[PDB]
C-alpha atoms as a printed R data frame, in Angstrom:
    type eleno elety resid chain resno       x       y      z
1   ATOM     1    CA   UNK     A     1   4.085  -3.537 24.679
2   ATOM     2    CA   UNK     A     2   0.332  -3.955 24.144
3   ATOM     3    CA   UNK     A     3   0.659  -3.251 20.415
4   ATOM     4    CA   UNK     A     4   0.084  -6.854 19.334
5   ATOM     5    CA   UNK     A     5  -3.427  -6.921 20.723
6   ATOM     6    CA   UNK     A     6  -4.634  -3.856 18.793
7   ATOM     7    CA   UNK     A     7  -7.294  -4.367 16.112
8   ATOM     8    CA   UNK     A     8  -7.024  -1.047 14.276
9   ATOM     9    CA   UNK     A     9  -4.648   1.742 13.373
10  ATOM    10    CA   UNK     A    10  -7.151   3.889 15.287
11  ATOM    11    CA   UNK     A    11  -5.880   2.479 18.602
12  ATOM    12    CA   UNK     A    12  -2.444   4.109 18.175
13  ATOM    13    CA   UNK     A    13  -0.938   7.576 18.732
14  ATOM    14    CA   UNK     A    14   2.113   9.364 17.335
15  ATOM    15    CA   UNK     A    15   3.693  12.829 17.410
16  ATOM    16    CA   UNK     A    16   3.288  14.872 14.268
17  ATOM    17    CA   UNK     A    17   6.303  16.651 12.795
18  ATOM    18    CA   UNK     A    18   5.602  19.683 15.024
19  ATOM    19    CA   UNK     A    19   5.859  17.551 18.177
20  ATOM    20    CA   UNK     A    20   2.161  17.343 19.138
21  ATOM    21    CA   UNK     A    21   0.794  13.928 19.987
22  ATOM    22    CA   UNK     A    22  -1.870  12.825 17.505
23  ATOM    23    CA   UNK     A    23  -4.548  10.221 18.158
24  ATOM    24    CA   UNK     A    24  -4.942   8.155 14.998
25  ATOM    25    CA   UNK     A    25  -8.641   7.498 15.611
26  ATOM    26    CA   UNK     A    26  -9.052  10.889 13.884
27  ATOM    27    CA   UNK     A    27  -8.729   8.834 10.674
28  ATOM    28    CA   UNK     A    28 -11.889   6.768 11.210
29  ATOM    29    CA   UNK     A    29 -13.961   6.918  8.044
30  ATOM    30    CA   UNK     A    30 -10.921   7.880  5.934
31  ATOM    31    CA   UNK     A    31  -8.772   5.736  3.648
32  ATOM    32    CA   UNK     A    32  -5.128   6.199  4.549
33  ATOM    33    CA   UNK     A    33  -1.810   5.610  2.823
34  ATOM    34    CA   UNK     A    34   0.849   5.194  5.545
35  ATOM    35    CA   UNK     A    35   4.445   5.305  4.353
36  ATOM    36    CA   UNK     A    36   7.989   5.574  5.672
37  ATOM    37    CA   UNK     A    37   9.822   8.358  3.904
38  ATOM    38    CA   UNK     A    38  13.289   9.802  3.367
39  ATOM    39    CA   UNK     A    39  14.599  12.949  1.713
40  ATOM    40    CA   UNK     A    40  17.820  11.679  0.126
41  ATOM    41    CA   UNK     A    41  16.536   8.590 -1.668
42  ATOM    42    CA   UNK     A    42  16.447   7.780 -5.358
43  ATOM    43    CA   UNK     A    43  12.754   6.999 -4.856
44  ATOM    44    CA   UNK     A    44  12.055  10.323 -3.124
45  ATOM    45    CA   UNK     A    45  11.026  12.421 -6.122
46  ATOM    46    CA   UNK     A    46   8.589   9.965 -7.681
47  ATOM    47    CA   UNK     A    47   7.014   9.031 -4.357
48  ATOM    48    CA   UNK     A    48   6.420  12.549 -3.079
49  ATOM    49    CA   UNK     A    49   5.117  13.945 -6.362
50  ATOM    50    CA   UNK     A    50   2.725  11.024 -6.906
51  ATOM    51    CA   UNK     A    51   1.508  11.079 -3.284
52  ATOM    52    CA   UNK     A    52   0.852  14.829 -3.456
53  ATOM    53    CA   UNK     A    53  -1.025  14.199 -6.727
54  ATOM    54    CA   UNK     A    54  -3.142  11.423 -5.184
55  ATOM    55    CA   UNK     A    55  -4.004  13.481 -2.121
56  ATOM    56    CA   UNK     A    56  -4.997  16.398 -4.329
57  ATOM    57    CA   UNK     A    57  -7.290  14.306 -6.522
58  ATOM    58    CA   UNK     A    58  -8.842  12.169 -3.773
59  ATOM    59    CA   UNK     A    59  -8.866  14.220 -0.554
60  ATOM    60    CA   UNK     A    60 -12.590  14.910 -0.998
61  ATOM    61    CA   UNK     A    61 -13.241  11.157 -1.438
62  ATOM    62    CA   UNK     A    62 -11.631  10.514  1.946
63  ATOM    63    CA   UNK     A    63  -7.989   9.792  1.134
64  ATOM    64    CA   UNK     A    64  -5.429  10.769  3.754
65  ATOM    65    CA   UNK     A    65  -1.621  10.557  3.602
66  ATOM    66    CA   UNK     A    66   0.525   9.825  6.680
67  ATOM    67    CA   UNK     A    67   4.288  10.293  6.339
68  ATOM    68    CA   UNK     A    68   6.743   8.804  8.827
69  ATOM    69    CA   UNK     A    69  10.342   9.940  8.256
70  ATOM    70    CA   UNK     A    70  12.823   7.153  8.946
71  ATOM    71    CA   UNK     A    71  16.622   7.235  8.870
72  ATOM    72    CA   UNK     A    72  17.167   3.463  9.041
73  ATOM    73    CA   UNK     A    73  17.877   2.917  5.319
74  ATOM    74    CA   UNK     A    74  21.117   4.222  3.827
75  ATOM    75    CA   UNK     A    75  21.019   7.087  6.348
76  ATOM    76    CA   UNK     A    76  18.826   8.843  3.784
77  ATOM    77    CA   UNK     A    77  16.718  10.862  6.273
78  ATOM    78    CA   UNK     A    78  19.418  12.467  8.434
79  ATOM    79    CA   UNK     A    79  17.888  15.907  9.000
80  ATOM    80    CA   UNK     A    80  15.886  17.346 11.860
81  ATOM    81    CA   UNK     A    81  12.085  17.287 11.872
82  ATOM    82    CA   UNK     A    82  12.332  21.016 11.057
83  ATOM    83    CA   UNK     A    83  14.288  20.511  7.852
84  ATOM    84    CA   UNK     A    84  12.099  17.601  6.781
85  ATOM    85    CA   UNK     A    85   9.105  19.903  7.169
86  ATOM    86    CA   UNK     A    86  10.665  22.461  4.821
87  ATOM    87    CA   UNK     A    87  11.647  19.676  2.445
88  ATOM    88    CA   UNK     A    88   7.998  18.570  2.331
89  ATOM    89    CA   UNK     A    89   6.914  22.168  1.718
90  ATOM    90    CA   UNK     A    90   8.999  22.177 -1.480
91  ATOM    91    CA   UNK     A    91   6.705  19.401 -2.756
92  ATOM    92    CA   UNK     A    92   3.646  21.379 -1.613
93  ATOM    93    CA   UNK     A    93   2.706  18.425  0.619
94  ATOM    94    CA   UNK     A    94  -0.674  18.990  2.268
95  ATOM    95    CA   UNK     A    95  -1.131  15.646  4.062
96  ATOM    96    CA   UNK     A    96  -0.028  14.728  7.570
97  ATOM    97    CA   UNK     A    97   3.660  14.409  8.485
98  ATOM    98    CA   UNK     A    98   4.907  12.776 11.665
99  ATOM    99    CA   UNK     A    99   8.088  13.007 13.700
100 ATOM   100    CA   UNK     A   100  10.996  10.797 12.623
101 ATOM   101    CA   UNK     A   101  10.762   7.231 13.924
102 ATOM   102    CA   UNK     A   102  12.240   3.761 13.579
103 ATOM   103    CA   UNK     A   103  10.276   1.213 11.580
104 ATOM   104    CA   UNK     A   104  12.400  -1.907 12.238
105 ATOM   105    CA   UNK     A   105  13.806  -3.325 15.461
106 ATOM   106    CA   UNK     A   106  12.624  -3.165 19.049
107 ATOM   107    CA   UNK     A   107  12.646   0.667 18.982
108 ATOM   108    CA   UNK     A   108  10.228   0.666 16.031
109 ATOM   109    CA   UNK     A   109   7.147   2.732 16.694
110 ATOM   110    CA   UNK     A   110   4.265   0.477 17.883
111 ATOM   111    CA   UNK     A   111   2.048   1.319 14.903
112 ATOM   112    CA   UNK     A   112   4.674  -0.023 12.492
113 ATOM   113    CA   UNK     A   113   5.115  -3.148 14.604
114 ATOM   114    CA   UNK     A   114   1.356  -3.711 14.330
115 ATOM   115    CA   UNK     A   115   1.114  -3.045 10.570
116 ATOM   116    CA   UNK     A   116   3.912  -5.502  9.778
117 ATOM   117    CA   UNK     A   117   2.172  -8.491 11.424
118 ATOM   118    CA   UNK     A   118  -1.275  -7.909  9.910
119 ATOM   119    CA   UNK     A   119  -2.579 -10.533  7.453
120 ATOM   120    CA   UNK     A   120  -2.235  -8.096  4.516
121 ATOM   121    CA   UNK     A   121   0.818  -6.279  5.924
122 ATOM   122    CA   UNK     A   122   3.250  -9.207  5.968
123 ATOM   123    CA   UNK     A   123   6.276  -8.971  3.700
124 ATOM   124    CA   UNK     A   124   8.090 -11.148  1.143
125 ATOM   125    CA   UNK     A   125   9.773 -13.735  3.395
126 ATOM   126    CA   UNK     A   126   9.883 -11.763  6.599
127 ATOM   127    CA   UNK     A   127   7.946  -8.679  7.626
128 ATOM   128    CA   UNK     A   128  10.744  -6.129  8.016
129 ATOM   129    CA   UNK     A   129  10.499  -2.881  6.099
130 ATOM   130    CA   UNK     A   130  13.006  -3.381  3.294
131 ATOM   131    CA   UNK     A   131  13.711   0.241  2.258
132 ATOM   132    CA   UNK     A   132  12.295   3.766  2.203
133 ATOM   133    CA   UNK     A   133   8.757   4.225  0.817
134 ATOM   134    CA   UNK     A   134   6.986   1.070  1.829
135 ATOM   135    CA   UNK     A   135   3.259   1.870  1.679
136 ATOM   136    CA   UNK     A   136   0.377   0.425  3.709
137 ATOM   137    CA   UNK     A   137  -3.198   1.040  2.555
138 ATOM   138    CA   UNK     A   138  -5.568   1.365  5.554
139 ATOM   139    CA   UNK     A   139  -9.354   1.186  5.313
140 ATOM   140    CA   UNK     A   140 -11.978   3.369  6.978
141 ATOM   141    CA   UNK     A   141 -11.963   1.000  9.975
142 ATOM   142    CA   UNK     A   142  -8.225   1.304 10.438
143 ATOM   143    CA   UNK     A   143  -7.305  -2.149  9.112
144 ATOM   144    CA   UNK     A   144  -4.355  -2.872  6.833
145 ATOM   145    CA   UNK     A   145  -5.758  -3.978  3.487
146 ATOM   146    CA   UNK     A   146  -2.592  -3.961  1.324
147 ATOM   147    CA   UNK     A   147   1.177  -3.422  1.455
148 ATOM   148    CA   UNK     A   148   3.272  -2.013 -1.414
149 ATOM   149    CA   UNK     A   149   7.059  -2.254 -1.557
150 ATOM   150    CA   UNK     A   150   9.570   0.533 -2.183
151 ATOM   151    CA   UNK     A   151   9.621  -0.169 -5.940
152 ATOM   152    CA   UNK     A   152   5.836   0.249 -6.328
153 ATOM   153    CA   UNK     A   153   5.069   3.832 -7.308
154 ATOM   154    CA   UNK     A   154   2.127   5.428 -5.481
155 ATOM   155    CA   UNK     A   155   0.053   5.585 -8.669
156 ATOM   156    CA   UNK     A   156  -0.006   1.777 -8.548
157 ATOM   157    CA   UNK     A   157  -2.170   2.224 -5.433
158 ATOM   158    CA   UNK     A   158  -4.736   4.331 -7.304
159 ATOM   159    CA   UNK     A   159  -6.482   1.382 -8.946
160 ATOM   160    CA   UNK     A   160  -7.100  -0.086 -5.472
161 ATOM   161    CA   UNK     A   161  -8.622   3.062 -3.939
162 ATOM   162    CA   UNK     A   162 -12.218   3.133 -5.295
163 ATOM   163    CA   UNK     A   163 -13.057  -0.126 -3.526
164 ATOM   164    CA   UNK     A   164 -12.550   1.645 -0.174
165 ATOM   165    CA   UNK     A   165 -14.251   4.991 -0.973
């Protein structure tokens, strides 16, 4: 339960959607959008298409996309990691997908615990993730620099990206 003392996303690890453990220090030097996702959500179409767009236009500038499936909201991510991976392929997603996790509660993955208590990752009255497609912008040093709620479309993030490239 050391997660509170971390200073950077780069001190965490998580299994990708294929089951291999990934060390998030691989993202040092890159700007990262970290988001909890779901396949059967009214937000799903606009979030995936805009995130794929952003990653296409800004990958060379250093932008990376980290997707964490999460079934805690309306049971809107009920499939296996396998089916999520094919779902993402239908959007032509080229970023990094991770295995399904929890984002709220004591079982929440330690990275999401850490993001929620950061000075720029705290939420509107309470820090809990409120629904699918909350987005955290992470800088090249692995620090949370902004948090966007489920209603904020990914293109809203675009105006904040140049400052970190």
